[PDB]
Amino acid sequence: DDIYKAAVEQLTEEQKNEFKAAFDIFVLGAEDGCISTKELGKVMRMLGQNPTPEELQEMIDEVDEDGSGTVDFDEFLVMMVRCMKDDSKGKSEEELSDLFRMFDKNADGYIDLDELKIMLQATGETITEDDIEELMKDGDKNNDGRIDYDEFLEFMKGVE
């Protein structure tokens, strides 16, 4: 349960406040602060997303993980940090291109799972083969088996 951190730590106070003020519409008021799933499709539109009815349902399918009928704050801000990146810049392509070259010491055009594994093991944490595959597959949007330069710049955006 750490994913919410990207969702909140990468926002400026006014960005979090716009997302919350719109989110609070999910409770009528003078109740219990339930925050129902019924207003989720509508709030994504209130905030600037333009989903189709299928997409409105996907937003509902991706929330209410505990079966309560409500949307929590992480579930909502976590989807939005991956949809409407109204972040506190989230650093930049130039900063990440410098890191890319640090990994890609051979100028091969990409970061393979071995370079990815070395940086993570070098961090002091114990890293498994699945842990490196999962980041590679998250960055590898085109399914080419590696994280390339463009994929890398997108991959590490919004990370501290």
Partner: protein, 55 residues
Amino acid sequence: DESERGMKVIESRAQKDEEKMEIQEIQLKEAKHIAEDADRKYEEVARKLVIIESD
């Protein structure tokens, strides 16, 4: 009274029809969304087929 009862039956019926209609809308939309995903999934496999066929 026949016309008023007519309206009560018809209004209730018109509402039943509105509900059956809404139900068909919901159901065709669910079915349509299944179709959006069935078609989307089709596209993913068809696209992957093209990629895999190309490969």
